[PDB]
Every structure is written in structure tokens, then in C-alpha cells.
Amino acid sequence: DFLWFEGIAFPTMGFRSETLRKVRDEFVIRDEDVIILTYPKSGTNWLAEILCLMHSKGDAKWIQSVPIWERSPWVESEIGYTALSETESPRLFSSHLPIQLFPKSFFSSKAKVIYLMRNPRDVLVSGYFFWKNMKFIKKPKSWEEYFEWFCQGTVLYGSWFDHIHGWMPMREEKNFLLLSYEELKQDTGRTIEKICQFLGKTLEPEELNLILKNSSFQSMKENKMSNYSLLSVDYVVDKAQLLRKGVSGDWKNHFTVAQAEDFDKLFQEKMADLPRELFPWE
Amino acid sequence: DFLWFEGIAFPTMGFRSETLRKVRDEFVIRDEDVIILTYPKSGTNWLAEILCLMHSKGDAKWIQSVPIWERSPWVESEIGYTALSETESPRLFSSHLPIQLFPKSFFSSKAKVIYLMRNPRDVLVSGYFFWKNMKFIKKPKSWEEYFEWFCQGTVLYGSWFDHIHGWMPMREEKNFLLLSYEELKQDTGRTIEKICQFLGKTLEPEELNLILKNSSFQSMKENKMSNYSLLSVDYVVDKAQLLRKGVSGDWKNHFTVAQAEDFDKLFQEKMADLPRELFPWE
């Protein structure tokens, strides 16, 4: 099962309805906050690690000594809700909340949000493999069942189409940056430069080079704090697996031509009201 | 007994020649640092508390839960030197170092330093009473003996006249703010606003009012974290007394007329090569 709150499914561990209500209604957003906004499995941790490394000008001291989920906690989670109000600025944190569930306090604030979007065919695949070792998530019978869950929106954090619809209006706001996992992957340095300019920071060539080096798929895979290897056995069976493949386009190795034709039609029906140029793929 | 390093006396506890060398030669200043530079008793802890409060926008949560010397460590102290390497940006910290002893690394950085200057007659008095409860400082036989030490510069951190001379040439640098205790005391709100503009920050009226409220002499005297009441008894007899009187002009209550005339003569002979408009007394 899931924890159901306002029509959206949430994990059965680490979340409470009472907290999620305070998150929306009471949680105080500071103008100095930097917030990562993802639909789950769109590169959230990648971007957190880039962000932590921009902040230290490439120096890996803190990403190797602090668990990634303390460095950029989930505001909607109990532990993150609680930790953040005790944390001095500048706070970095994450959320997979749809706009209507996001702390109301943000909309009168100057806080900076980075929304990362990803091809949902890739998010679908990424999630499909990830949820398997998680002890507390409802597992699909099959690739085909998960595919149908994903398309219907009856998955952790609701529909991708909905998530995206509801955040996209913000793209015209000065304190909203819209990125894609695709562009981040294609030109990581250019993207990091884009993030600096938005955040009003500069980096010297040497510092950028070291953030490229230290946020690589392999650095992260090898970093105990970042690879999810520290999760309790209360949460997970065997290990990880956050860092699976780390590319765009893996959906083609898993969708059948018939699945692909159906998603195309579904995607085309649901995203008709938004500009096609918004979506890098494909 | 003092620890003597480069012709400058340092406390018998908490300091090492070897560390002090690395402070000058090896300690790395980040462009995100905010540093308070004072000759001891110019108002270091009051500046520290204000800055902490500017950072939290008036919210006293962290000043009441973290010791002031941990919120703003002495870079030259052993504990400070070490703790700061491990601290994430933005770092706030304090120094009483004359320029020639200060991290060389600062001089190629954009780190912002706030120099706080105070009437040395008032500094003399503040130190005179302060040192009495401290177990590890060489104490004077009399008001007169201490007066003589201070004038000669044979006190912790050396001459006030030298300290001041060393740092003044910086007053023209973009990343240097020169303040006095006198102006901070006379118009606190306006001084805080001057620091904001320096540090590139804005505050809402309500936030300023809370910083004014919470950085008051009485708030600080009442705050267990800020008033030295936590100092280990392996450091002090009785308690405190950091929060003594909290005004300028108290030196008149202690200097005999003969001392005032001698000090005037000396101050006039030493500060002649500097513009008098630079010292807002008196």
C-alpha cells in the first residue's frame, strides 16, 4: 500500500499526513533557500551533488562525509521537515511535491527553485528497476503492470503529466529555473554555468573542472554517502541501487514498439496544452 | 607568562606557535568569509552577535543554542583554526591578529572583513576589569601598572597603536568595512544598515527591529551562550564578566586627570600620520 494524502501516494515509511499538512500550510520558506523540485527518478541526487559541489567550489570534503539525504533533505518527509526548521541558511533541500502540496509560504518568498524534468519513458524505466530492493513500496507483478500504473499516475507522487502541468506556469518567474536531465547530461559544464548564473554565483575554471570531476556517475557510485549504500536494512533488501546506468535513452531497451506507440499517443494527448519545444526528447 | 610569537603576546591557553605560523602561511580564506577584526575589547562579541542575528533575520534560535565562540571562532586559536577548515561556507569568524600575522591567503581573496575600532581609553578600562577573573592571564599589580603596560603595548595582542596602524591602509579596499564601537552604540540601527549594504544584504523593517531587540546589552547578558557563563572553570575564577557596562566614555570614571593628559600626549604622538577624522572621539 501507500500513504494517501490529497489524492497523491506517498511512501508508507517516513511520511505522516499530519506533517504533510504542516509542510503545505505552516512550513516557512526563507528567501535564501535553494530547492530541488523533481518528479521521482528524474536526477534529483545528481543535481543535489552538483549543488553541494558548487557551494564548495569543487571540494568533495562534505559530500564524502555527509549522507546525501542530510545535505539535501526531503522537506515532505518527517525527518526533513524537522531538520530544516533547525538548519541555518543557506538551506539546500529537495521535494517531489506537486505544486499544490508545496509549502504555501514559498509563493510570497524569493526562494530559488530548480525544477528538473526528464523524459518520462526514462523515469518510468528508472523507477521500475529502483523500487525492487525497497522493502516498503508496493511492487508491480510485471513490467507491463508498472507501465500501466505509471501511465495512469497511480504511483508514488502521482502522475508525471500532472506534476509537470502544475509546475510549468512558474517557468516565467525569475526565481524558477527549468532544466532537463537530458541537457544536464549532454553538456554538464554548460548546464552548471546556467545554474551559477541563476543563483548569482561565479566559479573559476579550476573549480568547475573539479565539480565535473566529483559529480561524475562513477564518483557518485563510489561515494558511500551518495550511493544509497548507507540506507538501513529497515528500508531496503540487498543494496542501492540508485546509480544504475546514468544515461538518457535507456527506455528504448525496455519499451516494445507497441508500448512506445501507446505512450507517444498518451504523451501527445496529455501535453497538447503545453509548447512542444519545452521537452528536449525526442 | 604569555606565549610570544613574532613579538606579540598571546594567551597561555588555547594557542601554539606552530598553529599561528600555519594561520599566517597555510590557512585558506574563502571569498565567502565574513571576518571580524578587532583589538580586544573593541566590541568583538557584540559585532559577532549582531552578525549572527543579521544572518537569521532576527531569529534568536541559534544564538541561544550555540556558544558565541563557536558561532564565531577565533581563527588564530587552536580550536578555531581546526574547526574552521571543516566548516562549510558561509563562515563567520573573529580575529585580533595584526595584519602581518593574518592569513596571507586573505590578501588575494574577496573575503569581507569588518574592522571594529574603539576609543583605546575605553578599551584599556574594559580589559583592565575583564582580565581579573581569568586564571591564565598575567595580572597587573595595580590600575597604574596596567595603564603602563597598555601604553607600551606589552599586553595580549600587542600595541593598540600598532594594530590600528597595520589595518588602516585597507580602509580604501572594497572588501573592508571600518566601524567604531562609538557609532555602533550611538546609532545601532543605522550601523546595522551600513553593514547590510556592505555585505550585499537587505533586511525588512521587522527583521532589523528583532536584531536590535536581540543584540541588546541585556539580551546578551541574559543569554547563556553569549555571556561567557559557560567558560570552563579551568579558564576563569567566579564568572563572566564580558558584559560589564556597555557604554562608551567610561574611561573618564577611571583615568586621573594626569593620566588623561599623558594618554592624550601619547595618542597624539602615535596617531599623527593618520587623519584625525578617522577616530570619532573625544
Ligand SMILES: C[C@H](CCC(=O)O)[C@H]1CC[C@H]2[C@@H]3CC[C@@H]4C[C@H](O)CC[C@]4(C)[C@H]3CC[C@]12C
Ligand atoms: C526519510 C527517510 C529517512 C531519511 C533520513 O534518515 O534522514 C528516507 C530514507 C530512504 C528514503 C527513500 C529512498 C527511496 C525513495 C527515493 C525517492 O526519490 C523518494 C521516495 C523514497 C521512497 C525515499 C523517501 C525518504 C526515505 C524513506
Ligand SMILES: C[C@H](CCC(=O)O)[C@H]1CC[C@H]2[C@@H]3CC[C@@H]4C[C@H](O)CC[C@]4(C)[C@H]3CC[C@]12C
Ligand atoms: C580557545 C578557547 C576555547 C574555545 C572553544 O572551546 O571553542 C577560548 C575559551 C575562552 C577564550 C578566551 C576568553 C578571554 C579572552 C577574550 C579575548 O577577546 C581573546 C583572548 C581570550 C583569552 C580568549 C582566547 C580563546 C579562549 C581561551
Ligand SMILES: Nc1ncnc2c1ncn2[C@@H]1O[C@H](COP(=O)(O)O)[C@@H](OP(=O)(O)O)[C@H]1O
Ligand atoms: N552522476 C550521475 N550522472 C548521470 N546520472 C545519474 C548520476 N547520478 C544519478 N543518476 C541517475 O539519476 C536517476 C535516479 O534519479 P533520482 O536522483 O531522482 O532518484 C538514475 O537513472 P537511471 O536509473 O536511468 O540510471 C541515476 O542513475
Ligand SMILES: Nc1ncnc2c1ncn2[C@@H]1O[C@H](COP(=O)(O)O)[C@@H](OP(=O)(O)O)[C@H]1O
Ligand atoms: N550588546 C552590547 N552593547 C554594548 N556593548 C557590549 C554589548 N555586548 C558586549 N559589549 C561590550 O563590549 C566589550 C567587550 O568587547 P569584546 O567582545 O571585544 O571583548 C565590553 O565593554 P565594557 O567593558 O566597556 O563594558 C562589553 O560590555
